Design a protein around this nucleic acid. Structure first.
Lengths: 141, 141, 49, 137, 191, 75, 61
RNA sequence: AAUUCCGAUAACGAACGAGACUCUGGCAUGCUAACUAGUUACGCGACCCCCGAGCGGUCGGCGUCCCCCAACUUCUUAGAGGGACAAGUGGCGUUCAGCCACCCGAGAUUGAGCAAUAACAGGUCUGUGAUGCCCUUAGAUGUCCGGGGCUGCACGCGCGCUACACUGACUGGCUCAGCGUGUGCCUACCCUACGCCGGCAGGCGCGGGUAACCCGUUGAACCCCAUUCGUGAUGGGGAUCGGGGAUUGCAAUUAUUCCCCAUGAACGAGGAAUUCCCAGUAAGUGCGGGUCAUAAGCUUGCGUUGAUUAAGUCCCUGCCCUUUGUAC
RNA sequence: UCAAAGUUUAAG
């Protein structure tokens, strides 16, 4: 019997699903490790959970992630949420709950985004203007 | 180690050098004179560009197969300054993509697949994934 | 309290400045000594609290 | 490196040696960033150089290519005058010669009393753009 | 990295705030100073939520300005990092501390609120809020750095460094510090 | 007021100034070299690459828009 | 003398256009002292103002 | 937020509007679901070549070859349920209506749609085989055909796009979307994969698609990463104009559009004025839909990147109630 | 604890 956990992260329209498995802790996105992805200025983001919790917590859990939708930044924020969420879901099911709780606490005090997904989503444009809230310029005279 | 394990930028540099050293591609007559797409104000500053984009096509083919000429134009697309009007998409040059794909065909990097469009072949998988390994074993950086 | 603090005399009760003012209607109304009233509330000649 | 010209005199024009070569040539009437780059590639010059470098032989070599493009495989398109009425030639007109060719064409339309020449004569827009709202000079 | 959080390279600890007022509303450290100055950060939700956004993030945000740079954060993240690098080479010490000092001597102390006053506009002096002082400081010196970097060969990062240095030093030489003393002088002239 | 005219050359005195002085600065950027001297900008970049290759100035970062260089690395 | 002053009670928002919070302040050094004053910017109970003047005390404006 | 409530009371008991309501947004490892979703992780049954690590095993990576007698619904589509109520804790409030904070967690507030009475002599007879009267009615104001015009330029104003650069430009490279739409038609034709020919616009072949099937992992832009350029009206800007080449069309000259070479204007951030906007908003950034043979500097949608500042006030401009004065 | 602010087809 194998220890499989498939957990998702979201940001606007970026469904990043991280999939944890009893392994040796590779952690690769689509088909490549966390040292590319390639917005790159936001590398420490997709690293953050690993940096917070350390390699010791991950150690025995290999995580293959798949992403689609969103744009570059949104995808990073999705995977970052997802791999952390997946790790928490692994520890819930196939370790012990006090350990999970400790991980969850360590993540949240850094940032609540790591588990909780933003509801914020693109607002709809309405006629009489180029965007949602902005209007087209008034002539008057 | 595969090609996805390598930072794709410094990969295509190494593949281009590989394709120069081989010296059996089939760079056509134009190269010097041509624009490269209706996008562009200018032609490429790197005077042996054909080798570079040939490499880029090959690596694209490894990552995603079944890529026809039209598909190769779409990937090499961008902004088109209408100048005083606003910008739009424009597909890259067909003929250059087609010449690149025919050049790779002669090398036996690639082969035209069933159900249309190019895919790279085992003998091509050789070179691509060999140079990946070379880049990985360049230095720890 | 500042003056109490720096007074020579102990405790000291302060003084008071008394003025009988004389507003004419115009000047009373403008300075909001007197507002208008409704036709029925005009007749309440008790002072306010 | 190279301490020589800096400033250049080519085909009646004063080319800035100070500038980089592909963009330095374009100072001449009739050669644009396309054609200059093409011309330089047919010359086989290290175009990273400034125009203030380069041997006098090299600049003469460039000039000969620029003048006579089709003898060194500068193709048909890259030619500002293709199929040019006064003889059925196809070539790239440069310097004062370009401006002279233009004036002859305007003069030709004028002599014909065509529409396009008349508007040219009247100092109006020729390429049927709306003139109610723009170009108030 | 696990026990203490660097800012890529730089330290959060050993960054002492001088003025008890800028303190609290400068989030260089509560304890919480993250790796990057990019963040999801819905700090515009409520009124004072803004204050608990980190000052290096806030500086990035302010940098992302004047039409063509609107929304381009990563662009400006890089700018910030380079300015911090440049501050480290030029001045020494932690660039975050330099930035903090600059903020402290760049925000006003009192401004002149435009009251009506009959009809023709003559103002009275009033004493600015610490958050408002932090806000002004940030945008003043960011703007001063921006205005410097247009039509001469100098990167934004370099300018941004030079402004922060000449703010941290009471130089009367940065835009921001000079602008602040001009506001203060106006305030005194109607206090 | 501003009308800034720069050099594009190996013109002896400036090249000596580069070899002596530039390696003692803390900030060494193409921009900072151009404002110190009256050197183009491209010329400044090339000059800073030569000093890197020689081993007189130290690399900090080599990013698209801005490169940064340091003093020798003294002791 | 640049005196600091902690806010005890944010009173009410004055100013013509609505801007200057009228604020009641403890005077930090000797907490017996307690003035009122107007402030540009967003203020809240439990923060510190930097008052350059220390003797003016605004009321209605 | 509200003529929303509480409460007062020559009023009583009602009606509309507001609210409720409908759609949408976001929470559901809960349930029902699948070859026109994924497959999902397996099994790797493999193919497969050294594909790589590696002496070789075992692993890493995809492309896929996969059906069905593998296993399911995490992602997917969309059903019907649930889900937040101001319900909890603390204040404040006549300890009412309610307001403030904080816990749990979306915190009453996601954004639209619908929308009263009474008006206006608002617009529309050029949307109607809705229509009164008036006019005209064969040398027609009917109707159709050819041509022209609605595009004409001393000038004045309105919504727009492009810019004035180096937080940039160019040249490469890398790499992520979401609403849609689509032929085989109401009168003649769609979306288009793949292969060759053409620098390019484009041309010629064959295919798929009445569509979660094919286009289509819609491989978008900005962004990101290496380029050179160096504050010079410069490689910024791309107007004007000369020459050529394509397609649409019955026909394109007064340039239909598109491509190419050449030309290279003002513009170095805009006086007095004044517009719009508070959260995934503004702004940037592209792509759909509309019109459409040809086709957007408009529009109406869509996402992608993502600020500053507010959280208030009646100063201006207006609006709502109350009292008031009024020769309107 | 009071700056300036004048006028409005004949054409129904």
């Amino acid at each position: 019997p194998l220890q499989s956990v498939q957990v998702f992260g979201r940001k606007k329209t970026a469904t990043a699903v991280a999939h944890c498995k009893r392994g040796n802790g590779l952690i690769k996105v689509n088909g490549r490790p966390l040292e590319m992805i390639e917005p790159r200025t936001l590398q420490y983001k997709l690293l953050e959970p690993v940096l917070l919790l350390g390699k010791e917590r991950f150690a025995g859990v290999d995580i293959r992630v798949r992403v689609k939708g969103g744009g570059h930044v949104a995808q990073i924020y999705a995977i970052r949420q997802s791999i952390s969420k997946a790790l928490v879901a692994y520890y819930q099911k196939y370790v012990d709950e006090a350990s999970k709780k400790e991980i969850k606490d360590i993540l949240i005090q850094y940032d609540r985004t790591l588990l909780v997904a933003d509801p914020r989503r693109c607002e709809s444009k309405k006629f009489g203007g180029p965007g949602a809230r902005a209007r087209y310029q008034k002539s008057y005279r | 180690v595969t090609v996805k394990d390598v930072n794709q930028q410094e990969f295509v540099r190494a593949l281009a050098a590989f394709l120069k050293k081989s010296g059996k591609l089939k760079v056509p007559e134009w190269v010097d004179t041509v624009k490269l797409a209706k996008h562009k104000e200018l032609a490429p500053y790197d005077e042996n560009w054909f080798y570079t984009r040939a490499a880029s096509t090959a690596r694209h083919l490894y990552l995603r197969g079944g890529a026809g000429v039209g598909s190769m134009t779409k990937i090499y697309g961008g902004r088109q300054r209408n100048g005083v009007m606003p910008s739009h998409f424009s597909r890259g040059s067909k003929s250059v993509a087609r010449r690149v794909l025919q050049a790779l065909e002669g090398l036996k990097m690639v082969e035209k697949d069933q159900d249309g469009g190019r895919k790279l072949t085992p003998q091509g998988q050789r070179d691509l994934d060999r140079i990946a390994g070379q880049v990985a074993a360049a230095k720890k950086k | 309290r500042d003056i109490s603090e720096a007074s020579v005399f102990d405790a000291y009760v302060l003084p008071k400045l008394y003025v009988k003012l004389h507003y004419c209607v115009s000047c009373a109304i403008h300075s909001k000594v007197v507002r208008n009233r409704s036709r029925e509330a005009r007749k309440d000649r008790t002072p306010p609290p | 490196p190279e301490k020589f010209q800096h400033i250049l005199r080519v085909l009646n024009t004063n080319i800035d040696g100070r500038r980089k070569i592909a963009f330095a040539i374009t100072a001449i009437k009739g050669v644009g960033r396309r054609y200059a780059h093409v011309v330089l590639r047919k010359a086989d010059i290290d175009l990273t150089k400034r125009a203030g470098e380069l041997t006098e032989d090299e600049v003469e070599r460039v000039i000969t290519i620029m003048q006579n493009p089709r003898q060194y495989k500068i193709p048909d398109w890259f030619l500002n005058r293709q199929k040019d009425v006064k003889d059925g030639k196809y070539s790239q007109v440069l310097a004062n010669g370009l401006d002279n060719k233009l004036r002859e064409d305007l003069e030709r339309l004028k002599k014909i009393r065509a529409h396009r020449g008349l508007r040219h004569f009247w100092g109006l827009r020729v390429r049927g753009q709306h003139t109610k709202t723009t170009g108030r000079r | 990295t696990p026990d203490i959080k660097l800012f890529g390279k730089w330290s959060t600890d050993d960054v002492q705030i001088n003025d008890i007022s800028l303190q609290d509303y400068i989030a260089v450290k509560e304890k919480y100073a993250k790796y990057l100055p990019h963040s999801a950060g819905r700090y515009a939700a409520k009124r004072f939520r803004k204050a608990q956004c980190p000052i290096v993030e806030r500086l990035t945000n302010s940098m992302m300005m004047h039409g063509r740079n609107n929304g381009k954060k990563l662009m400006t993240v890089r700018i910030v990092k380079h300015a911090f690098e440049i501050i480290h080479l030029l001045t020494g010490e932690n660039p975050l501390q330099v930035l903090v000092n600059a903020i402290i001597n760049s925000g006003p102390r009192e401004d002149s609120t435009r009251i009506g006053r009959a009809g023709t506009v003559r103002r009275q002096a009033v004493d600015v809020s610490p958050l408002r002082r932090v806000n002004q400081a940030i945008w003043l010196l960011c703007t001063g750095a921006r205005e410097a970097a247009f039509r001469n060969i100098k990167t934004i990062a370099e300018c941004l460094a030079d402004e922060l240095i000449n703010a941290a030093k009471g130089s009367s030489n940065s835009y921001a510090i000079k602008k602040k003393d001009e506001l203060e002088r106006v305030a005194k002239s109607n206090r | 007021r501003d009308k800034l005219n720069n050099l594009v050359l190996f013109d002896k005195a400036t090249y000596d100034k580069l070899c002596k002085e530039v390696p003692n600065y803390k900030l060494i950027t193409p921009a900072v070299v151009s404002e110190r001297l009256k050197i183009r900008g491209s010329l400044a970049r090339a000059a800073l690459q030569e000093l890197l290759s020689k081993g007189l100035i130290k690399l900090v970062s080599k990013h698209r828009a801005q490169v940064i260089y340091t003093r020798n690395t003294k002791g | 003398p640049i005196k600091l002053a902690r806010v005890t009670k944010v009173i009410g928002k004055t100013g013509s256009q609505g801007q200057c919070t009228q604020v009641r302040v403890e005077f930090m050094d000797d907490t017996s002292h307690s003035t009122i004053r107007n402030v540009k910017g967003p203020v809240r109970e439990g923060d510190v103002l930097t008052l350059l003047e220390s003797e003016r005390e605004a009321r209605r404006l």
